[PDB]
């Protein structure tokens, strides 16, 4: 399972991806990973496809 933390702001522009151990054990780590960021938005997890998007 690789997740994957696109931010949508003019502010930050990024893309990264990577693979875990577990779903779960990425899915909490990669919710600390744009943390430090301190990005302010709509974050939310896409079960979709397993792909992290926010929306500022």
Excluded: P, R, S
Excluded at 35 to 41: A, E, K, Y
């Amino acid at each position: 399972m690789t997740f994957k933390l696109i931010i949508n702001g003019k502010t930050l522009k990024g893309e990264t991806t990577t693979e875990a151990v577990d779903a779960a054990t990425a899915e909490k780590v990669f919710k600390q990973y744009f943390n430090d960021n301190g990005i302010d938005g709509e974050w939310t997890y896409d079960d979709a496809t397993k792909t992290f998007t926010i929306t500022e």
